[PDB]
């Protein structure tokens, strides 16, 4: 049944398994192998090994990891241990197999051997991201991780959206709400048709408005409408854009905002129609609560 | 019997069938042997998995 292949490849290219709960992650791990060994037709070799390394990461997340060593042994055969995926995989393997930090130094000089472009730039970009992930745990927690990213970011690799997105997340978590607008604007700049960076760039403006003055509140809510209308224009059943437009227009409640309220209520009742699954429960509550 | 314009209806009594089959078999085996190399090498190296 190739629909399982569709689900697995969507999880793959979205990397949604990172955001999985342990129960659904266990379900993913259990239902992976049956198709992995049963439905072996029409599946290319590259997808075969991509599924293998997804299973490697799922096992490493999971409690038991002897199968992680087994899977790494099976996948070592092609392209050895010089590919960036393999380097990251074995670094994680040595980090978790004994809870020893040593891998970082055997990675560190490796980054200092990649300056001569022996591999692609995405390779040691990914290695830099992983070593920052290592070092934020080596010194358990600090704001300096953002500084590390910035010094790794600004000179070396502006283009990468992921770094700016993590900077914006850290700024939004407890930091300033203003620099996050700049970071999200850049993420919008690199990826033109991102329809979830407009929802975040409207939510951050809404959060910045709730502690502002009345004229600044009006300006920020106007900008939130002008940024949420693009999440409306780039997707129809996008839940968060419609909910945010409805919420801010309800907060204002003007006549043409009342027109937008009627339209957004109709669209949120369309979303909460039972075609969509488990997004009805977060739309209907916001609809019928107030 | 005479053939003023040459014999073009009946093909030949000296047609080289074996050389043609040898050419076809050489092309078939060289394709069948070179396919795994290009497939594995380029598809697994271009994505850097």
Swiss-Prot record, chain A:
Keywords: Endoplasmic reticulum, Membrane, TPR repeat
Localization per record: Endoplasmic reticulum membrane
Recorded GO CC terms: EMC complex; endoplasmic reticulum; nucleus
Domain of life the protein comes from: Eukaryota
PROSITE patterns: TPR
Membrane topology of this protein: Peripheral membrane protein
GO biological process: phospholipid metabolic process; phospholipid transport; protein folding in endoplasmic reticulum; protein insertion into ER membrane by stop-transfer membrane-anchor sequence
Placement of TPR repeats on the sequence: 161-194
InterPro entries registered for this protein in UniProt: EMC2-like, TPR-like_helical_dom_sf, TPR_rpt
Subunit structure and binding partners: Component of the ER membrane protein complex (EMC), which is composed of EMC1, EMC2, EMC3, EMC4, EMC5 and EMC6.
Family the entry assigns: Belongs to the EMC2 family.
Purpose: Part of the endoplasmic reticulum membrane protein complex (EMC) that enables the energy-independent insertion into endoplasmic reticulum membranes of newly synthesized membrane proteins. Preferentially accommodates proteins with transmembrane domains that are weakly hydrophobic or contain destabilizing features such as charged and aromatic residues. Involved in the cotranslational insertion of multi-pass membrane proteins in which stop-transfer membrane-anchor sequences become ER membrane spanning helices.
Leftover remarks: Present with 5740 molecules/cell in log phase SD medium.
Protein name from the UniProt record: ER membrane protein complex subunit 2
Organism per entry: Saccharomyces cerevisiae (strain ATCC 204508 / S288c)
Source species taxonomy: Eukaryota, Fungi, Dikarya, Ascomycota, Saccharomycotina
Gene name of the record: EMC2
UniProtKB/Swiss-Prot annotation, chain B:
Residue ranges, Cytoplasmic side: 35-49
Transmembrane regions: 14-34
Post-translational modification remark: N-glycosylated.
Compartments where found: Endoplasmic reticulum membrane
Function: Part of the endoplasmic reticulum membrane protein complex (EMC) that enables the energy-independent insertion into endoplasmic reticulum membranes of newly synthesized membrane proteins. Preferentially accommodates proteins with transmembrane domains that are weakly hydrophobic or contain destabilizing features such as charged and aromatic residues. Involved in the cotranslational insertion of multi-pass membrane proteins in which stop-transfer membrane-anchor sequences become ER membrane spanning helices.
Misc remark: Present with 2840 molecules/cell in log phase SD medium.
Similarity-based family: Belongs to the EMC1 family.
Subunit structure: Component of the ER membrane protein complex (EMC), which is composed of EMC1, EMC2, EMC3, EMC4, EMC5 and EMC6.
Protein name (database record): ER membrane protein complex subunit 1
Organism: Saccharomyces cerevisiae (strain ATCC 204508 / S288c)
Gene name per UniProt: EMC1
């Amino acid at each position: 049944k190739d629909l399982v292949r569709e689900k697995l490849l969507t999880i793959m290219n979205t990397k949604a398994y990172t955001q999985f709960n342990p129960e659904q992650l266990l379900q993913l791990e259990n239902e992976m192998k049956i198709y992995m060994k049963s439905g072996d037709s029409a599946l290319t070799e590259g997808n075969y090994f991509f599924l293998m390394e997804m299973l490697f990461y799922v096992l490493v997340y999971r409690n038991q990891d002897v199968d992680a060593q087994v899977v790494y042994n099976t996948l070592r055969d092609r392209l050895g241990e010089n590919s960036y995926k393999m380097v990251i995989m074995k670094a994680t393997l040595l980090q978790i197999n004994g809870n020893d930090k040593g891998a970082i130094e055997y990675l560190e000089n490796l980054l200092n051997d990649d300056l001569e472009y022996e591999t692609d730039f995405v390779t040691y970009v990914s290695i830099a991201k992983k070593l920052i992930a290592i070092k934020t745990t080596s010194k358990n927690l600090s704001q300096e991780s953002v500084l590390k990213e910035v010094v790794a970011l600004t000179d070396k690799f502006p283009l990468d959206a992921e770094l700016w997105w993590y900077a914006s997340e850290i700024y939004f978590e407890m930091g300033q709400f203003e620099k996050a607008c700049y970071c999200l604007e850049q993420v919008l700049c690199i990826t033109p048709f991102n329809y979830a960076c407009f929802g975040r760039l409207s939510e951050t403006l809404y959060y910045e408005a709730l502690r502002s003055k009345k004229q600044t509140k009006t300006e920020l809510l106007e900008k939130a409408l002008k940024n949420a209308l693009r999440s409306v224009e780039l997707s129809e059943l996008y839940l968060k854009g419609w909910a945010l437009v409805n919420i801010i227009s309800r907060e204002l409640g003007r006549n043409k905002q009342n027109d937008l309220i009627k339209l957004s209520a109709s669209k949120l009742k369309e979303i909460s129609a039972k075609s969509n699954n488990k997004d009805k429960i977060t739309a209907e509550l916001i609809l019928n609560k107030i | 019997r005479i053939t003023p314009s040459g014999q073009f209806d009946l093909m030949s009594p000296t047609f080289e069938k074996g050389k043609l089959l040898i050419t076809i078999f050489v092309l078939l085996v060289i394709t069948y042997f070179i396919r795994p190399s290009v497939s594995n090498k380029k598809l697994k190296s271009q994505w850097l998995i």
